[PDB]
Amino acid sequence: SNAVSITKKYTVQSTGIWERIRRALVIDPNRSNGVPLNPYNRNPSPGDNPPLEYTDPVTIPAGDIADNPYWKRDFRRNYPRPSVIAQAQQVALLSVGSAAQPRVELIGEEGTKALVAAEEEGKEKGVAKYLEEKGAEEAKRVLALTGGLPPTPSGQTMVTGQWDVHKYGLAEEQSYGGSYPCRSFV
Amino acid sequence: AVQPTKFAVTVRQSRNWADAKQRVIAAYRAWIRAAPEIQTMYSIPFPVSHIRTRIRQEFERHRYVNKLNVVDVLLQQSNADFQETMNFWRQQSHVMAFFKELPSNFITGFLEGRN
Amino acid sequence: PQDGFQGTRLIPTGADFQSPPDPFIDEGARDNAANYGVQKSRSGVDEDSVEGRKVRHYTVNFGPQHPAAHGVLRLILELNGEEIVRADPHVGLLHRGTEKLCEYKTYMQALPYFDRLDYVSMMTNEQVFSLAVEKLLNIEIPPRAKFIRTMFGEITRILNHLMSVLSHAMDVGALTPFLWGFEEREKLMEFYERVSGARLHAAYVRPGGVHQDIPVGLLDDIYQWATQFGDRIDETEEMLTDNRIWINRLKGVGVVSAADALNLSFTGVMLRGSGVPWDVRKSSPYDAYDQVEFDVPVGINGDCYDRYLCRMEEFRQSLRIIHQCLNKMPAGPVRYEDYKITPPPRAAMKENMEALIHHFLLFTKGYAVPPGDTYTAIEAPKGEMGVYVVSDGSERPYRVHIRAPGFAHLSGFDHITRGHLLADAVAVIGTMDLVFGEVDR
Amino acid sequence: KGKFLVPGAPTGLTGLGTHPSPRSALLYLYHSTLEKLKQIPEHSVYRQSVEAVTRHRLALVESVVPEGYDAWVERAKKLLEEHADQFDPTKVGPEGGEEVQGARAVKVERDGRVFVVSRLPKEEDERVLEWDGEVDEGPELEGSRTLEEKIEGGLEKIFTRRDVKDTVGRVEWEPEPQLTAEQVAELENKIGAGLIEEVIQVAEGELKLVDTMVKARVWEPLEEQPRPGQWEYFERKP
Amino acid sequence: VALPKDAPNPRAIPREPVGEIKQALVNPADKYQSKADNLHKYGAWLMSCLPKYIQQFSVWKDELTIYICPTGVIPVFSFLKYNTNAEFTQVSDITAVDFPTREMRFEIVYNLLSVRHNARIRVKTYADEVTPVPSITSLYMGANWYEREVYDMFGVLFVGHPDLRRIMTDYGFEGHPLRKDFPLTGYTEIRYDEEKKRIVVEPLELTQAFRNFEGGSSAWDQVGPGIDRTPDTFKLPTPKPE
Amino acid sequence: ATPAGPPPKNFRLPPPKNWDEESESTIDKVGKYFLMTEMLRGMYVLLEQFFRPPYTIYYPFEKGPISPRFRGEHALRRYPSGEERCIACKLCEAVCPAQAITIEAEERADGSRRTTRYDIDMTKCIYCGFCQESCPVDAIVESPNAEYATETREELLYNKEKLLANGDKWEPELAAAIRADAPYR
Amino acid sequence: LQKVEVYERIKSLLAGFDKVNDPNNITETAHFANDLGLDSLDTVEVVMAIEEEFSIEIPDKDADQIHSVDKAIEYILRQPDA
Amino acid sequence: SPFNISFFIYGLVFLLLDLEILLLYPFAVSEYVNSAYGLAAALIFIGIITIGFVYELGHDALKVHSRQLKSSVVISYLGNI
Amino acid sequence: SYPTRTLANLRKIGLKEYFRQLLYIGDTKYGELVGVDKFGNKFYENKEELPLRTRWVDYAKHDYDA
């Protein structure tokens, strides 16, 4: 059985005949009575723990006196801004692409005037109108942005190194065996 | 889903002013029909005439509203206040808090302190 | 706004977009046994809309002054004889305006409010608020704080389950397990009162780590308690799991299907009882959870009995996590090492100028949280506990909304209880594990 | 014994049972969805998305053929073509007939694919089954009655309803071969959306969603431009 | 005390000393860039499938928000409940935020979960004291009580809602206490009255008035502007020289 | 419900077992039914609890354990010379989460920055310890005392006269608690 | 019931109402609004008073139709209660 | 006001089985004289009483119904026309 | 208390004290004196006792208060 011995369980013990009696008449002689040990439990009291012994901990970079300006650890003021996309410049991102995947070259001058038009056409006509006049293949290129199928929403685990769905599996050991309607998962 | 309670009414918008007109009459009728039943539920020691007087005045304060979207908020509140009263969720202190059983002149207000 | 004054286009409604089922494959008029003739309108002659508004079912106020109410619930029950036809839970009797009071507090000043929502799970409530502010602060709390917060997170889970499971057994009529388990929780509030100065409202877990470091004897005493807590779980296991009166009071009671449990906003055991593998500490690991091994109890019948078996397994899994935290406890600070966020040590505040200025500003103005909003959720002992915090960029939150698991659960009460008897309602209040500090807020 | 899943056996998710026919049901559900999208313009990304996802998942379900399917489909054609009157919804109704205590079946068309939906009479114990499971419409109208009341009674049903044991002009429809429990797992490894019973319910909700999208006309231009200041918060100028 | 034979005193065990502690500095926002591209594509994809209703989307760290007009509540939440790539079958939460500077005061914020894809999403719409919002109780049984809380706390009607009444406030209560203009302590208070033998309501007096220390807020801005973290795939191209 | 991707291995439950497939003997199944066997085990487990030491302590002769960090009633403290440590910075008045502290100060006759008023509404306090956390000079502390229940609420409105008297009486523990708990602060 | 019986009680009730302009204007074919000077809410109270006196319930659909004394008399005869 | 009692069929049968066990008490105090011939009648009486009890168990007359069925639609695929 | 303990403590303290202790503590406790308050209260310790019972006070006043 998955019982540890009573002799390791840090509770007050029976002794002598009463130990023999109790192991004769209990259901599990390795079960403890729940009564803690006066010499071991909370001994010494925290009010007599020496103050000099505990040392308040400082980490090397943050707490150092010579290798940290505050501004290279000021992560609160380096907070991300929300990145907001509207229909006015989703039509734009469809018109000419993106700094990652541009659509046309936009070489030098005379490309800037096309750049503003992509934003201007988004502000004048939205996404539904944009897909209306380019037809259905522009809508098909929208799925091409995600490889042809619609994108999957992002999972929130990253326990495997990449943000994914956590893969629940049945635990190797089932605590209720199979006898009870509760199954164990990992 | 869970069952809506006894007087639960689905929240719907008034189609037109004729709709609102008929609903407000339905709500006023339903209140004054229930005044005898409110009196014995809440052991009101006043007569039912006073209770119906107060119902009339509550409706009269919204008399001069010419906006459908303000009336429908108002028709919502009365529906919930009616449902709340008839199911006996509120108690006598709440119903008596509703019955009150400012200075009338500048000079009266001045002499007593502001009011 | 202005257009609403006169009649205009009606705002579309869920009734409008209703669709007719296909008649070729439709089978049955009721795929759910929750609506299978165990509600209102299953008797009488006429409906209660016209000519039926003059009569009432036998209506009884189950609470607030009631033991099974466990506090401050006014559950208006309509009884057909001894059978429930309609259950209307009335809450707000412990509504104290916590979410409005938080708007006139600094972020530090609002943290004790979270101690008092699910007020058997204080340090877990503190954690979800501390993790939302830390996310809006864009700071990374040190490893020792993360291990203290996960260990006291599971000490809190055991404390909640002792109150939850054994209060539930007390309602069904079993008195003795309640008494045994309240010595164990009385043991565990020493660990609270030794790291904080309170048995209940610790105010310990705060944005940036924890308030103080654990005292030098605490880990040994937690391990000593841990060596005997298995026996405690087994002796309460010994009075209820096989008891035939326990099995026939809970098996087949409060049954919710997997697909309805999600649609009802159920989380935690209320969801895992229905067969769904879902744990917020498995799916969005927070603090040190992704550094420990534990199993996830999942039921198969979605009833009070499976939910009981899942919670008694979480006793054993919480004790398993606690042992790993004791073993993996690192050294280092328990507060993020930035005095612009967390208070400096009293030694430093009395010794150095920049420590005194920062101590003075953190306790008068508070720290400023960069503007934005966030939804942060954790696996609370009662389910997905969440908070929606809106930040001005100032030192007071613009909006603090608490997503309480029991608020979402008490709402599905009439769905799962209508058709059962009055004792079965008592059974379902305890399996659904309500504390009305979180329900009302 | 363990070759096939047992319909209605609990799956491990409460209220979710084993589907009596998961393969055909997904095809019926997918083809039915690919039919309703056609009332959406081709430039809708919603159409192209659902149209893309459904066809991708359709080809996977086809890839898992039950044993003997070709033999049964050749037989089952010779039944539908020879006795189309029996399985015609325009003749026997959408529910397969009126006698629930016998076997029933209609022929259904989706995208041009042909489906036959059957309703085997419910399996109940002999000792709690009255009149073979006949429907109880209550006592026949007796005494002095008007013609209209006799009409409302169901008097036209004497001349159209069938004694279930009367089977000469009809053929007993044998349904489609099913997927051996190994193939069910193999198919659902391809689809990757949980159990096949889960995949089915997501498919049928996907079918009902199309009607709501079509009505709303979700592919048309934005209704309400947000007014100035609507989505401003507490941001600091960059 | 009868001590167990194999349980030594655990305090009596010597701990090996720990001296210099090294701790790397981390921006907790850096882990969220590996799915920045993915959260922007999903938000963009929804913008294209439902352009009648979705006004904008924002991506902060791992949270994707979808901004919609109120007339599209039913179709958008129908799409997020039933689509294969959008199996958002819970409503985690429904709350409101009051912005009195905005004509439409109230921001209705819904939070959804997709346990299938381990994904969360936020949808935001707007209303005022007279504009109602379509209820989602037909798609989400669990949304019944959330919408009642918004109606009680802020005063937002939810057209189509069955049994829309107060859930948090006292029975006869008048006013919406999560509105910004609603005072913190309210307008009334109660006491038991000896002459009337009941609980009565009275105008609010306070033995000690609430002390608002908000005027002690910093005269200096303490957070700054932040940083931009938009990925290149959702920024416009730059015209290269010559 | 289940995670997206391949379904969990063996997530589908095995087919149900029939009545004649349950591999329990009739003699055992019927014996357990009629002999009330599982509930006799529960009866026995209570018996061995009956012969275990009780947990009970005899309050007030015995007291349960409290730590140096324990937060009880408030006390104002003095330096070893009898000078008040309080200097009227008002930090605790600011940080209070329940606005239970009201302080009025002036320059004292000798030009010292000292409080003229010092009140704690003990029926507004939440006993969080934030006020003693913030003190620059260790003036406001929460005593280890929890037994101070009163007949009226006026007895719970502490003025400076009551709070200094508390420190004057409780100083030996307040000092021993600060000594034992200071390095962790 | 009797037509004269179901009309005599109405005159006493209508005259008994506090703020009708004058008790003489009540006739068998008199209008509440045009003649008796009763606004919307006063008319709803009058049908409410009539229903209470006759111990009958007047439904919303036909309650609106009663804008004149004659309409009240015909409804009272039509409904079988007294 | 009138209140549903879901166990009143128990009260009716309780009425008659009391009369039945009372009619068996004189036999208990007269066995030495009743002997075999008197035993037979007592068994004939208890057998008829027991048949009516099997009637009450068989019909579920002593059952209070309370709580708060699988798919039967098989689709078939013939493919194209 | 239990018979071995109660007789052992009763033997040590005497019958007169046994009845006094049955009047205030209601228990039968034996231990060594550790000190006396300024109020006359008497404090004892016995580590050979159940946890949280190793320290106790003999209250000086009859109308004893914590």
Ligand SMILES: *P(=O)(O)OCC(C)(C)[C@H](O)C(=O)NCCC(=O)NCCSC(=O)CCCCCCCCCCCCC
């Ligand atoms: P006629 O053409 O004159 O029609 C009269 C009416 C009133 C219909 C007006 O002409 C009209 O259309 N005006 C605008 C609508 C209006 O008056 N108000 C909107 C209706 S809601 C409302 O008024 C609610 C009032 C308060 C709640 C109901 C009253 C009862 C409160 C509680 C009573 C006692 C409980 C203990």
Ligand code: SF4
């Ligand atoms: S913080 Fe301390 S020193 Fe400062 S005013 Fe308050 S009590 Fe006095």
Ligand code: SF4
């Ligand atoms: S401990 Fe009491 S007095 Fe001190 S800050 Fe907290 S509530 Fe205020």
